[PDB]
Motif scaffolding. Structure first.
Motif, short mmCIF file in Angstrom:
data_model
loop_
_atom_site.label_atom_id
_atom_site.label_comp_id
_atom_site.label_asym_id
_atom_site.label_seq_id
_atom_site.Cartn_x
_atom_site.Cartn_y
_atom_site.Cartn_z
N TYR B 125 0.83 -1.20 0.00
CA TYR B 125 0.00 0.00 0.00
C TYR B 125 0.86 1.26 0.00
O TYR B 125 0.59 2.21 -0.74
CB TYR B 125 -0.94 -0.01 1.21
N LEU B 126 1.92 1.27 0.81
CA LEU B 126 2.82 2.42 0.88
C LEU B 126 4.25 2.08 0.46
O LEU B 126 5.16 2.88 0.70
CB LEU B 126 2.82 3.00 2.29
N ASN B 127 4.47 0.92 -0.16
CA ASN B 127 5.79 0.53 -0.64
C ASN B 127 5.73 0.18 -2.11
O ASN B 127 4.79 -0.49 -2.56
CB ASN B 127 6.35 -0.65 0.16
N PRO B 161 -5.84 -10.61 -8.99
CA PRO B 161 -5.54 -9.23 -9.40
C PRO B 161 -6.69 -8.27 -9.16
O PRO B 161 -6.45 -7.09 -8.88
CB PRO B 161 -5.24 -9.38 -10.90
N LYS B 162 -7.94 -8.74 -9.26
CA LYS B 162 -9.09 -7.88 -8.99
C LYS B 162 -9.15 -7.50 -7.52
O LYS B 162 -9.32 -6.32 -7.19
CB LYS B 162 -10.37 -8.59 -9.42
N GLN B 163 -9.02 -8.48 -6.63
CA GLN B 163 -9.17 -8.23 -5.20
C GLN B 163 -7.98 -7.49 -4.60
O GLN B 163 -8.15 -6.72 -3.65
CB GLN B 163 -9.39 -9.55 -4.46
N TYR B 164 -6.78 -7.70 -5.14
CA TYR B 164 -5.55 -7.15 -4.57
C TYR B 164 -4.87 -6.28 -5.62
O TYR B 164 -3.99 -6.74 -6.35
CB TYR B 164 -4.65 -8.27 -4.06
N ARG B 169 -0.31 -4.18 -9.10
CA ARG B 169 0.55 -3.09 -9.54
C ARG B 169 2.02 -3.46 -9.40
O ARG B 169 2.81 -3.26 -10.33
CB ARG B 169 0.23 -1.82 -8.75
N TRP B 170 2.40 -4.00 -8.24
CA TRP B 170 3.78 -4.41 -8.03
C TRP B 170 4.17 -5.56 -8.95
O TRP B 170 5.29 -5.59 -9.48
CB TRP B 170 3.99 -4.78 -6.56
N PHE B 171 3.26 -6.52 -9.14
CA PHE B 171 3.55 -7.65 -10.02
C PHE B 171 3.82 -7.19 -11.44
O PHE B 171 4.73 -7.70 -12.11
CB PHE B 171 2.39 -8.64 -9.98
N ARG B 172 3.03 -6.24 -11.94
CA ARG B 172 3.27 -5.71 -13.28
C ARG B 172 4.59 -4.95 -13.35
O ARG B 172 5.23 -4.93 -14.41
CB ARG B 172 2.10 -4.82 -13.70
#
Lengths: 197, 197
Positions: B125-127, B161-164, B169-172
């Motif tokens: 969330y903040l990283n 990906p929908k729920q998290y 974003r980080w995975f992409r």
């Protein structure tokens, strides 16, 4: 200058304490780093490390690798074209230390003491040290795991030095090698007696 | 010149393969070291490493630390007075990588996928990265553990990906960062498809 706090509970970090003691003795032979060992009643069995300039959760057997890296104690990261001091030789040893970790990971040592000794005694049949021909973090880690069974403090555990001569020979070697670093600690010594009751 | 053989069975060593690919690409930008990945039908789930000049038993997530040390890929051992590249900062990161190892150690990821995502999504969330502000071995290790759930290959796993969103974003981000190193492998890519069926 740099401050690192190691918070421990039930299990005193003998490995990290021994590594730090060796680091202090090396400086005497030669900005330094201070490592504090704090008895925290809220810690159960792991180790809690705080960096003072952020905290992490670790264990004695694992964070001692970090201390050797930071303190350059030459037990896991080789600071020494020697016979067995190559970079690839260094990497090979590190995987061997991980094998000892896996060999005792999630294993009741008191319950499996005989099978553990059945391997170490045969491993020491043709080896002086656990890895290569010099003191390493593998020797010291296994030394404290075996200490209650081979120190002789517990008279009911005198059967282990009798049955496993090779371990007893190696244990007496590591004890002498570590004597200049841990015998005068009086806190490591005290915690050994407390753990051994 | 130096030869290292990694023998794998059911579980392909994506982390070690990715580290070695980055090492090869760095040399192109610049005696080298050859690492072989061999499909051994006698290996079950761990990794077996043979040093050619002696073998050890390890795992992908653990031996990749050794490869980063040997190959100087700057993912676990920092080869870079930067903002977060101090020696003590380096040591602090290493203990953080061990935390991710402990977080998934002996844990059925398929069974605990929701609680695992409940933490990683809040951590992101903040990283931007798992540790500090740059790609590290923690990002790549967790990337392959999450790959089946966030790649989109498995249509039944599109709910993650929908729920998290934060993990997505980080995975992409990690996928794009690793694109120049793993997209043309065609063996890492093939094993990803085999693992994902």
């Amino acid at each position: 200058d740099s401050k690192i706090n190691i918070y421990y509970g039930k299990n005193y970090p003998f490995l990290c304490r021994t590594v730090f003691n060796i680091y202090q003795n090396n400086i005497k032979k030669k900005k330094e780093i201070c490592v504090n060992f704090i008895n925290d009643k809220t810690v159960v069995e792991d180790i809690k490390v705080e960096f003072v300039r952020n905290s992490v959760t670790s264990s004695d057997k694992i964070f001692a690798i970090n201390l050797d890296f930071l303190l350059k104690t030459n037990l896991y990261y080789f600071t020494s074209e020697n016979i067995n001091r190559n970079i690839i030789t260094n990497v090979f040893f590190q995987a061997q230390y991980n094998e000892w970790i896996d060999f005792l990971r999630n294993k009741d040592i008191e319950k499996n003491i005989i099978p553990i000794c059945e391997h170490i005694n045969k491993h020491l049949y043709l080896n002086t040290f656990l890895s290569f021909h010099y003191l390493t973090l593998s020797d010291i880690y296994i030394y404290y795991e075996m200490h209650k069974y081979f120190s002789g403090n517990i008279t009911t555990n005198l059967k282990y030095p009798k049955q496993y001569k090779n371990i007893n020979r190696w244990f007496r070697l590591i004890k002498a090698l570590l004597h200049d670093h841990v015998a005068t600690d009086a806190e490591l010594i005290q915690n050994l007696k407390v753990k051994e009751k």
